[PDB]
Amino acid sequence: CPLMVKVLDAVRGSPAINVAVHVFRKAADDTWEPFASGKTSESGELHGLTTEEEFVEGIYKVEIDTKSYWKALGISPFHEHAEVVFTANDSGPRRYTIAALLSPYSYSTTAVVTN
Template identity: 60%
Template sequence: MHKSAVCVFLASVLLLCNTAPVDHHGGSDAKCPLMVKILDAVKGAPAGSVALKVSRRSANGEWTQVANGVTDPTGEVHDLITEQDFSAGVYRVEFDTKSYWKGEGRTPFHEVAEVVFEAHTEGHRHYTLALLLSPFSYTTTAVVVKTHD
C-alpha cells in the first residue's frame, strides 16, 4: 500500500510539472509573470473555482494583498499580476482550499494552503506555482524560468 501511494504521488508531481505551460507564456511574461495551476488529486482533474490571494511582505514584516483570482475550469489562473506590480520581494499565495473541498462535499483538514517564496532574487523570472490538492494534504512545486538576460 505504501509503495502504491508513493507511486501515485510521484506520478502526480510529474503530471504537475508537465502541465505547467512554461513555453506558452514565454512571449507574454509582461502580462503573466506569476501563473497558478491546481490539480485535484481525488478526482485526478484540474481544480476549478479555487479562490486565491497574493500578498507581498513589506520591510516591517506586514503582508499587503497585491492580487487575487479564481482558478478557471482548467485549474489555472492567468494574468494574476502584472510584471510592474510583481517586484522583487517575498510573496505569499494563499489558496482557499476549505471552500473548494466543501463545494466538493468533503470535510478538509486545512483551512488554506499557503506558498511563501522570494521572487526575483537573481533578476526577472516567470513563476508557475503548481498545487496538488487532497482533503488532508497538499503538495506544491514551482517552475521558475529566467525570462530576460
C-alpha cells in the same frame, strides 16, 4: 505573465476549478499586504494576476482557499488553506508558476521558474 498559479485535485483527477487564490507581498513593517487575487479557471489556472511592472523582488505569499473547495464537493478537509511563501529574485528566470496538488488531508506544491 510573470506569475501564474495552477491547482489540481488528486481525488477526482481534474483541475481544481473556481478555487480562490490570494497573493500578498511582505511590506517593510513585516505585514502582509494584498497584491493580487482571482479564481481558478475551468483548466485550474489563474493567469493575469500581475504585470512585470508591479511584480518586484520581495517576499510573496500565495494563499489557496482549499477548505471552501472541498466542503462544496461534500468532502471533509483538514487545512484552512494551502500557503506558499517564497522570495521573488530577479537574478534567476522570469516566469513563476506555482502549482498545487490538493487532497483532503494533504497537499503538494512546486514552483517552476522558466525564461
